[PDB]
Design an enzyme around this catalytic site. Structure first.
Site, PDB file in Angstrom:
ATOM      1  N   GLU A  48       7.938  -8.295   1.387  1.00 53.99           N
ATOM      2  CA  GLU A  48       7.238  -9.467   1.901  1.00 53.99           C
ATOM      3  C   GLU A  48       6.887 -10.417   0.761  1.00 53.99           C
ATOM      4  OE1 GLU A  48       3.977  -8.341   4.332  1.00 53.99           O
ATOM      5  OE2 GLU A  48       5.105  -6.806   5.424  1.00 53.99           O
ATOM      6  N   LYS A  77      -4.409 -14.501   0.342  1.00 49.94           N
ATOM      7  CA  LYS A  77      -3.166 -14.005   0.925  1.00 49.94           C
ATOM      8  C   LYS A  77      -2.754 -12.680   0.296  1.00 49.94           C
ATOM      9  CE  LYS A  77       0.486 -14.211   3.516  1.00 49.94           C
ATOM     10  NZ  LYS A  77       0.365 -13.818   4.945  1.00 49.94           N
TER      11      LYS A  77
END
Ligand SMILES: [Mg+2]
Ligand SMILES: [Zn+2]
Length: 1478
Positions: free
Chosen positions: A102, A115
């Site tokens: 990711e 994040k």
């Protein structure tokens, strides 16, 4: 606006890689014509290129189909149960290894960190969920701070995003296809410049939404405060207040909180401090000495009498028979990895050790390695004898009947095969097997019959879990010797080593030690690092004793046996000339030694607190006034009898010292008692238990809020009115304190502020009364965006009265360890810290505008010290005060109400208003914060409730939990008004304290006819009085006391409480733990010694030397003698030697004197050590160095040396440097001396090559935000998962040094023993050792060629010597190049150990200069490493050149806060060395 479309379409058509995945989106973009669809397709294609570059760069398969993880498993035939919603961007399966990739793109720091935290936590959760699959998972996260990639060049991508932005704003102004929020978000995302570009005006981006709460709060701040009064209308109120206060105090309603000193009463109160169990007041010294040596099993074992060995039996204990050799070899072999050790490759090891033991036995009859009927196995086990025989016979019978052969034949076959496998695997890497001194003779032709025909007789080694019948005599060791310390050192070393054993007669583990003759065995039955039972055993009589100690607290006494003795001996010499103390001098020594040994034997927290509480008593004993509630604060709960014995010893000592009939020297006894009190630093800093400390800290945090009556339980994000009206109500209540003009009178120690004094302070600050002379002069598109990888969603849009729209500020609570009590700690996010820093530095600047603070400024501290010294010299009055409960009693509301009433003069009035609005908004934000409750405490409380709810004291916090537990609620967050952020808001409180103390001093001066000076740093204060008040003290003892009580009352009126540990006096003064006396100085010797003792860490062994050097340099400047520091350095060197690490002449110098610490620096001591090593050769080089420096000072060559000689070979060049002048050259057998460097290719491993200056430059440079985004946060996350101690650190260090810890020429790993073996192979090189031990080698010149693979590690000596000498001579005066000599002419005096003398050393640089010099001198490295990212500099170039070319240690020639003033014994300077500069 259409030609742009054509040119960008052509540029992207010509500059796109031919990928079967990329062509689809390429054609989908090139076919489109509508501008909105062009926007969508361009964004999608850019995201695709970024994600595919990330997926292919990290070696992974890209998830184009966007399949979930369980889908990927099921397609590969991997069956798994149901799972949560997760989608991997890149997935890879290789064997049993799973890879997830990711990735994302962010430009803002806060957004990046949020994040990262989010996806990291999510992936850790999913790793936990997938651990059941029996397949490993390792996530990989890439967060970039730019749109650069590989599939596209830079300029076309930049112009693409630029034209995309232009069409975006065009279509927004044309069709308005987007609403305001998403449009602004997209602009801020694709701008790549709006990430962080503004400062304080950033708050101007959002909206206000401040509707009603703000007005109510601001009005409540302004309700009844008057800030317009003049100077004439405040004096009257002060006078009236003083009048009524004095009257009500004299009447007998006001209490009064001060007493006059009385030494006899103080001593009598101290003696009867614990009169419930110690039913006496006097204690004979002899009975104490007698019963001290029998208290605890450790103490009994320490002073027992064990003289085993007639003088010949102990002689064999230094012979190192074959059993130990076989054990060590087998351990080293098992350290590797061999297959099938389960019950097969372990019995053979025991058989071999047993055979070696039998062989060593029936040749000279030695009795070692045995214990009753048991022997030490390979892994420090305690295996029996018979069970091994049964296993052996079973195994041999089974293997034989599995198939004429003979038992001995099978045994020898198995043994030889396993030994051949082992020796092959060992020869494989780097070592032969002939260096272990083992022989294949213990394997006799017949061994099985020998195994079956052995027998022993002895006792059973046991362990008992609690009368005590000691097998020896209790006490026969005199206290004056140094035997108990050595016994303690050895026992503590064994206890620390007991932690090395790994996990898997049940099972018993044993370690071995020996004191002088026979050897003892420490036995335990459990692994890990935790409290456990230990026993001591011996082969003659087993089970000597047993106890329940803890391993990780026994470090400070390992090899420091000769250090503590000198400590006590030099502490005694102070009180030695007291003409009324000679008859009692051995008792003092005995008491001190007993206290030290006792505190080193049983380290606990209670003893630490008890010993710390002595300085307050000794300070009060020599003052004039003190608080009345002092004695009650010196008592704490004790449990065990060891603590009571310690208290009795302390009482006896303090009665012997500060008795009557003593009037000679008070300063010496004061220093002695203070140094005795400061022994609490010897115990430890860490915590004994973790849960109890958390409970205590949470209780301390929650206590003072349950009486003010304001606690919020789980507040909602959308604040209801039920909370806001309560907040306003409590805010109003906070300003309703009465005093001295009411019915009930004043009440003490209650949070609040009075309106009268606030008005007075504001008015006096406004009209101007607190300034000196030198002061007045100054909707599908949303999901489309959600698919993107650079569209952020975590930026605030508008604020309110209770913080930003995202949510109120949140904090986490945790404790910080400290000697004595533990401190509290608040932790916030990054955006919160960025928000708070504005208030912080604004208030810091505002305070710097004024004068008097001492928190971070470094100029005012010297003025404070000077004023204290002068005041003490003139014998005036000094007030030393600390405030109590400073943290949890302040309030941001107070700071806001104080700021809202000050008027400045021509300070950008409009910008002044705007800044006031910003600050008020931020403080209103802080007022509404939330704190998180820990999880362990609530879990434990729930467990305790459930336990003791179905089957008394009821601590009030437990009552709170029980109340809000049974109605269906679980506390998670708590908010209130009363708690100021401990440590968060710091400078503002300093400013407030400054102005408050200034106003209070002004008032006190306006009452009487005197003035006061004050100094303060946010929690501590020292006040100095003038001559008038000092005269007033001993002329009218009533006005003085009334003024003091009025000062106390006033301070209480402004929410400042004086602690019961404050003192008014004329004999001593203290500020920031720095005591001062008229005719002496007070050093804290034991403090520095204890700090230096346990201060090691597991790092590279050339930085611990630097740390210890800095510590000792800091400590010498206060008064510690030198030989103590030498002994400390020797202890450090011995600690290193124990780890089997070769010692080189670049670590420490344990022969220093006074001058080597005052004038010189780090490199001077190394030069002195090298000069001590090899004389008769350094003078020849020193003459040439003198001539060269004299020539270079006038700037003669500066270039022939820079490149021709420095950047070339070492040896030959040196010779040329001698023929460049008329000096004799160095002899041929002078360049033979050389040392050994293990880090010649790469530094050692812990868990190309360039100079270290390049390392630190690329470190400090590639870390701002973009070049250092990922690495710093990754390493922080990695370090957060580690918790260690000092003992575990030393164990880890001892472990790493000996596994591989070495890199070869190209890329490989080796062992240190292999290197030393290859060295010892060549019989032409000669090692040499010194007294303390410093290995240096002599190598010949011819032997170098022929084997150049191992000689690449050595390094000559004269070259490095010249480098370092020239560098330090440039850095310091030119006297260094002289010839040193000791002074051997001064006669011998009779010195007293208390006589000091001050000294000053014999006396900018930037980061751009080194860069410019490396450019203009070494362009090659510069254009590839720094490019991708007159008299003064003339010598800086030479400095950096010498640093680059001679990399042994001369790095410190540029890396170097350094103290200036020194205070040293005058009896030491007259024995130093002299250096002549001729
Ligand atoms: Mg103080
Ligand atoms: Zn022997």
């Amino acid at each position: 606006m259409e030609d742009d479309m054509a040119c960008v379409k052509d540029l992207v058509s010509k500059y796109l890689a031919d990928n079967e995945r990329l062509s689809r989106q390429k054609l989908a973009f090139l076919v489109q014509t509508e501008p909105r669809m062009l926007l969508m397709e361009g964004l999608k294609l850019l995201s695709l290129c970024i994600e595919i570059d990330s997926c292919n760069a990290n070696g992974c398969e890209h998830n184009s189909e966007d399949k979930s993880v369980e889908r990927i498993l099921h397609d590969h035939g991997i069956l798994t149960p149901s799972l949560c919603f997760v989608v991997p961007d890149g997935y890879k399966l290789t064997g049993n290894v799973l890879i997830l990739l990711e990735c994302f793109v962010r430009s803002s720091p806060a957004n990046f960190e949020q994040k990262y935290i989010e996806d990291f936590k999510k992936l850790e959760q999913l790793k936990e969920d997938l651990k059941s699959v029996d397949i490993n998972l390792i996530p990989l996260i890439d967060g970039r701070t730019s749109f650069y990639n590989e599939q596209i060049p830079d300029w076309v991508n930049d112009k693409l995003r630029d034209t995309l932005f232009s069409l975006l704003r065009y279509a927004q102004e044309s069709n308005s296809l987007f609403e305001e929020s998403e449009y602004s978000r997209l602009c801020e995302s694709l701008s790549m410049t709006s990430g962080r570009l503004s400062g304080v005006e950033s708050l101007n981006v959002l909206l206000d939404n401040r509707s009603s709460h703000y007005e109510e709060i601001i009005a409540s701040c302004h309700q009844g405060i008057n800030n317009k009064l003049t100077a004439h209308e405040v004096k009257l109120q002060i006078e009236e207040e003083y009048q009524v206060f004095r009257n009500r105090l004299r009447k007998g309603e006001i209490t009064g909180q001060f007493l006059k000193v009385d030494k006899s009463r103080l001593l009598n109160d101290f003696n009867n401090l614990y009169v419930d169990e110690v039913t006496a007041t006097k204690d004979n010294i002899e009975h104490l000495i007698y019963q001290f040596k029998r208290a605890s099993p450790i103490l009994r074992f320490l002073y027992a009498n064990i003289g085993e060995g007639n003088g010949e039996e102990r002689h064999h204990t230094i012979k190192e028979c074959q059993m130990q050799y076989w054990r060590s070899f087998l351990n080293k072999v098992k350290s590797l990895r061999i297959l099938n050790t389960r019950r097969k490759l372990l019995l053979i090891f025991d058989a071999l050790i047993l055979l070696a033991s039998i062989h060593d036995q029936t040749r000279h009859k030695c009795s070692k390695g045995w214990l009753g009927s048991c022997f030490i196995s390979v892994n420090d086990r305690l295996v029996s004898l018979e069970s091994t025989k049964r296993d052996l016979e079973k195994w041999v019978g089974r293997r034989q009947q599995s198939e004429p052969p003979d038992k001995n034949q099978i045994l020898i076959s198995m043994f030889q095969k396993t030994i051949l496998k082992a020796t092959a695997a060992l020869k494989d890497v780097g070592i032969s097997v002939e260096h272990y001194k083992i022989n294949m003779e213990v394997i006799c032709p017949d061994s099985y019959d020998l195994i079956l025909n052995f027998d022993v007789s002895g006792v059973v080694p046991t362990i008992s879990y609690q009368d005590e019948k000691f097998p020896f005599i209790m006490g026969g060791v005199e206290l004056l010797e140094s035997t108990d310390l050595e016994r303690l050192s050895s026992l503590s070393l064994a206890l620390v080593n007991s932690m090395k054993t790994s996990s898997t007669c049940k099972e018993a583990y044993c370690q071995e030690f020996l004191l002088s003759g026979a050897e003892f065995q420490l036995i335990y039955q459990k692994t890990g690092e935790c409290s456990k039972c230990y026993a001591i055993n011996d082969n003659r009589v087993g089970e000597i004793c047993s106890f329940y100690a803890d391993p990780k607290r026994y470090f400070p006494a390992i090899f420091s046996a000769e250090v503590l003795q000198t400590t006590v001996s030099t502490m005694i010499s102070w009180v030695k000339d007291c003409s009324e103390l000679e008859e009692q001098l051995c008792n003092i020594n005995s008491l001190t030694k007993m206290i030290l040994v006792l505190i080193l034997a049983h380290p606990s927290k209670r003893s630490q607190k008890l010993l710390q509480n002595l300085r307050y008593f000794i300070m009060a004993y020599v003052s004039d006034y003190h608080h009345k509630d002092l004695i009650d604060k010196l008592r704490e709960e004790l449990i065990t009898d060891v603590e009571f014995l310690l208290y009795r010893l302390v009482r006896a000592l303090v009665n012997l010292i500060l008795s009557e009939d003593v009037k000679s020297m008070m300063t010496n006894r004061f220093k002695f008692i203070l140094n005795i009190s400061y022994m609490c630093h010897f115990i430890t800093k860490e915590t004994p238990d973790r849960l109890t400390d958390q409970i205590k800290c949470f209780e301390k945090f929650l206590e003072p809020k349950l009486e003010f009556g304001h606690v919020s339980i789980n507040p909602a994000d959308v604040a209801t009115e039920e909370e806001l009206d309560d907040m306003v109500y409590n805010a109003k209540k906070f300003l309703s304190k009465e005093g001295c003009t009411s019915i009930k009178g004043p009440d003490y120690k209650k949070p609040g502020v009075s309106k009268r004094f606030l008005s007075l302070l504001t008015s006096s600050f406004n009209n101007g009364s607190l300034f000196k002379e030198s002061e007045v002069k100054r909707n599908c598109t949303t999901a489309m965006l959600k698919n993107l990888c650079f569209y952020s969603q975590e930026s605030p849009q508008s604020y309110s009265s209770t913080g930003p729209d995202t949510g109120r500020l949140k904090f986490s609570l945790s404790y910080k360890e400290q000697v004595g009590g533990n401190r509290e700690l608040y932790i916030g996010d990054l955006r919160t810290k960025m928000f708070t820093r504005l208030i912080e530095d604004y208030f810091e600047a505002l305070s710097l505008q004024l004068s008097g603070s001492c928190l971070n400024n470094e100029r005012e501290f010297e003025n404070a010290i000077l004023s204290m010294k002068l005041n003490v010299s003139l014998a005036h009055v000094s007030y030393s005060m600390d405030h109590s409960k400073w943290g949890p009693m302040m309030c941001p509301f107070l700071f806001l109400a104080t700021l809202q009433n000050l008027i400045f003069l021509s300070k950008d009035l409009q910008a002044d208003i705007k800044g006031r609005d910003y600050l008020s908004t931020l403080l209103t934000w802080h007022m509404h914060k939330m704190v998180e409750i820990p999880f362990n405490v609530v879990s434990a409380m729930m467990k305790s409730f459930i336990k003791a709810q179905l089957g008394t004291t009821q601590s009030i916090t437990e009552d709170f939990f029980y109340s809000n537990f049974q109605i269906g609620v679980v506390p998670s967050h708590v908010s209130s008004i009363l708690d100021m952020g401990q440590g968060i808001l710091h400078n503002t409180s300093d400013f407030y304290a400054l102005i408050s103390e200034r106003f209070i001093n002004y008032a006190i001066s306006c009452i009487c006819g005197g003035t006061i000076d004050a100094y303060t740093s946010s929690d501590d204060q020292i006040s100095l009085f003038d001559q008038v008040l000092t005269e007033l003290m001993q002329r009218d003892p009533e006005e003085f006391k009334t003024l003091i009580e009025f000062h106390y009352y006033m301070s209480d009126q402004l929410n400042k409480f004086v602690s019961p540990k404050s003192v008014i006096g004329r004999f001593v003064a203290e500020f920031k733990s720095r005591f001062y006396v008229w005719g002496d100085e007070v050093p804290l010797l034991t403090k520095f010694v204890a700090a230096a003792l346990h201060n090691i860490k597991c790092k590279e062994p050339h930085q611990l030397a630097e740390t210890i050097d800095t510590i000792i340099d800091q400590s010498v400047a206060n008064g510690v003698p030198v030989h103590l520091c030498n002994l400390i350095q020797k202890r450090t060197l011995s600690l290193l030697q124990y780890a089997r690490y070769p010692i080189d002449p670049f670590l420490l110098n344990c022969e220093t004197d006074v001058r080597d610490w005052v004038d010189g620096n780090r490199s001077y001591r190394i030069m002195r050590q090298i000069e001590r090593l090899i004389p008769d050769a350094c003078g020849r080089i020193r003459s040439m160095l003198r001539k060269l420096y004299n020539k270079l000072k006038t700037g003669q060559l500066h270039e022939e040396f820079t490149t021709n000689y420095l950047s070339s070979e070492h040896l030959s060049s040196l010779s040329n440097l001698c023929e460049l002048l008329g000096v004799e050259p160095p002899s041929e057998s002078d360049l033979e001396f050389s040392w050994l460097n293990l880090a010649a290719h790469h530094p050692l491993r812990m868990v190309e090559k360039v100079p270290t200056i390049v390392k630190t430059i690329q470190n400090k440079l590639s870390s701002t935000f973009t070049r250092g985004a990922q690495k710093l946060l990754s390493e922080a996350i990695n370090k957060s998962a580690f918790q260690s101690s000092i003992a575990s650190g030393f164990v880890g260090l001892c472990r790493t040094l000996g596994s591989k810890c070495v890199r070869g020429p190209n890329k490989e790993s080796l062992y240190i023993k292999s290197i030393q073996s290859l060295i010892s192979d060549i019989q032409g090189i000669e090692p040499l050792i010194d007294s303390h031990g410093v290995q240096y080698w002599r190598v010949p010149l011819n032997i170098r060629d022929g084997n150049e693979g191992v000689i690449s590690y050595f390094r000559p000596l004269l070259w490095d010597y010249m480098c370092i000498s020239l560098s330090t001579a440039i850095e310091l005066g030119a006297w260094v190049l002289g010839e040193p000599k000791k002074v051997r002419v001064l006669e011998f005096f009779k010195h007293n150990p208390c006589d000091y003398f001050p000294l000053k050393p014999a006396a900018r640089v930037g980061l751009n200069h080194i860069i410019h010099s490396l450019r203009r001198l070494y362009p090659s490295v510069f254009e590839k490493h720094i490019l991708p990212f007159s008299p003064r500099i003339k010598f800086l170039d030479l400095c950096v050149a010498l640093d680059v070319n001679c990399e042994a240690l001369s790095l410190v020639s540029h890396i170097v806060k350094r103290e200036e003033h020194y205070i040293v014994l005058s009896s030491e300077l007259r024995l130093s060395h002299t250096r002549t500069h001729e």
